[PDB]
Symmetry: D2
Subunit: 216 residues, 4 copies
């Protein structure tokens, strides 16, 4: 049920600082190559009055290249699928939380995403749209209470230099019993490859690969 | 346009650990006495698989008794009203965030509430429904960036003793220009007065009073 | 063995952002009235390159007025005494941690204090010495694992208005078995009454009172 | 002033939950190989009533292998040296903070370390000594206010499975003006290679290598 080429359809509904928005996307990815791409359109709440970048990691670790020697929690979970829950705590007190319920219909993954954020300062980099991109990162994954956790300290690069930090904590929950992996890592890189002026239209790419870190 | 007795209608839509739910409420309160009560009904997602208590502070500081010597940000904001944004960070890593948009229709406040929480551990007191009540508390309120902030370290009492801590951070935003207050406090006390077995029906009370502290 | 008037001697050794310092103090207080004062002198590391205010809460809850209806963990612990451990997490990522070991010699409490802080930004209000005073506050106290916990969200007022928040988490540990109290509060107010230009010499006051909250 | 083989002498003084201790160490490392090792002896406060593992990352990024294409803040800082300040926030509310002032005398680095920790629960993995080792990790490094920051979400493996998380935030401060690097990573792995029963004697090794993460 996992093919080398898969399709993606998503809808995100959410709010930031109380202002509602919705986004839909269609994309495709290569589960065994750890690559995916997507075209996204703002359907409600546009033009978004906050940095689009805070949304992009919400738009599926199935699309991570896993080696033979590491248990792949995500690929095992299908056809039933899995869901995730995530908090994103920014250094200036802004906080977002999101969830994705991921199902499979034929060769198309369907994401139902909810995203909510609060307490972003009016003069902060998020509401003033001064973010440039996410730096690449390494997520740490480990088992807790029979489910899988993923943590990572991320950073947005800012216009005119400097970085803006965010601590991500994710819980991933398979919809059926699956084999549990040992502690491992997923390196990833997410990139807006193109966008129009107010980000109503966005082409988004991600590359991700699991590994076991420095040996000995 | 603020009367001694006012009505309340609310809808909350939300999710905890990805589990969607919705609650409706009707109540009434006394803005100048700092009291309010309401009846709440789970309309979707019932029976709620998490402690009801995490929701109750989301179910309006206009219902706080303010003395003459303290600027009342909330009462000033009407008829236009105000909105709030809040994060609630629990000591075991559970996080909720909520927003309320509050408007006025005649004598009736209307709340549009959104509530979301994630990362509550399966074995923790929230998902295990081991909470008893919120202890009384005191919110600290202060101005930042031309809007009003409210912070408080809250605690839930737990079944079989002990407490479970949660740090609240709220931003309040008037829909019009109002006078901004100096640093002050709001003491409050929130109580579920009655409920049925699975909390499908709940009668909720709050009492709150602003003050300027210890000399 | 607790008298209406008691003396205090302390030494604090510490470091902020890796910069070592040391302070000595002599003072006196009134355990049953919940008042205390003291004179403090920087002995090493002067002139301190950070806001003095971050240190003052480290410079003893025995000097809190407890009513009859609340168990007094602190007064019970003497003559053996008690110790405390505390973290202070500021909103800009600055972190301090402190410990005090408190003993009794005749009529004189002796404090051995250690204080350390890191990650205060160069441009932040602590390293820029832009703090004015701590606002009055209310500590929440409650039992966990047979010892007493104290939590409070504190705020420093800043020069030119605005506030700077800090979350306090303390653990208090009696040196002997004592009666454990129920959930309660300690209101307190701490003030630098006088100081010289670079805070080499400081006269510090505190007033504190326990209570059970809002009904 | 940077040699392929360098010596290390350190003293750490500190307290955990108010109980004071002191440790001294002698070791050596290979700055260009990103390898170092050390023998440590508890001089005061033994036998330590808490997990030794909380101390080990306090016992110098000079010993990280840096590629040509990444600015090496640490090697540049010598002979004058640099200092660091660090907070370590554990998921059960335990908190440690430490500082190291690092100087150079001939071919020997001298570390003066202070370490303080509080609010470790009596029944937690630290006071009950149920930690096994630190998992390998990837530190994220970036410039802020003209100094270098390093953040990483770390994890201790626990006896009988499971992990215990800790968020590290470090500030590194060169003692002279040096070139500032772009955002980068340092993968590392720290290991107690041998110890006696109560950890009075410990042989500690670390391997570390800088890189720039996933490309494109």
């Amino acid at each position: 049920v996992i093919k080398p080429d898969m399709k993606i359809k998503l809808r995100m509904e959410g709010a930031v600082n109380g202002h509602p928005f919705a986004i839909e996307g269609v994309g495709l990815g290569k589960p065994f190559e750890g690559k995916q791409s997507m075209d996204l359109k703002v359907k409600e709440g546009g033009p978004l009055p906050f940095a689009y970048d805070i949304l992009t990691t919400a738009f599926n670790r199935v699309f991570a290249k896993y080696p033979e020697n590491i248990v792949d929690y995500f690929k095992q979970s299908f056809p039933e699928g899995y869901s995730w829950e995530r908090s994103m705590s920014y250094e200036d007190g802004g906080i977002c939380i999101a969830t994705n319920d991921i199902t499979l219909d034929g060769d198309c993954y369907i994401y139902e995403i909810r995203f909510d954020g609060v307490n972003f300062p009016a003069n902060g980099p998020v509401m003033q749209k001064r973010t440039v991109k996410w730096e690449p990162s390494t997520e740490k994954l480990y088992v807790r209470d029979g489910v899988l956790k993923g943590d990572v300290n991320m950073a947005l690069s800012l216009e005119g230099g400097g970085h803006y930090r965010c601590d991500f904590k994710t819980t991933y929950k398979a919809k059926k019993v699956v084999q549990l992996p040992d502690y491992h890592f997923v390196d990833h890189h997410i990139e807006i490859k193109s966008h129009d002026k107010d980000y109503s239209n966005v082409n988004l790419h991600e590359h991700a690969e699991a590994h076991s870190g420095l040996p000995r």
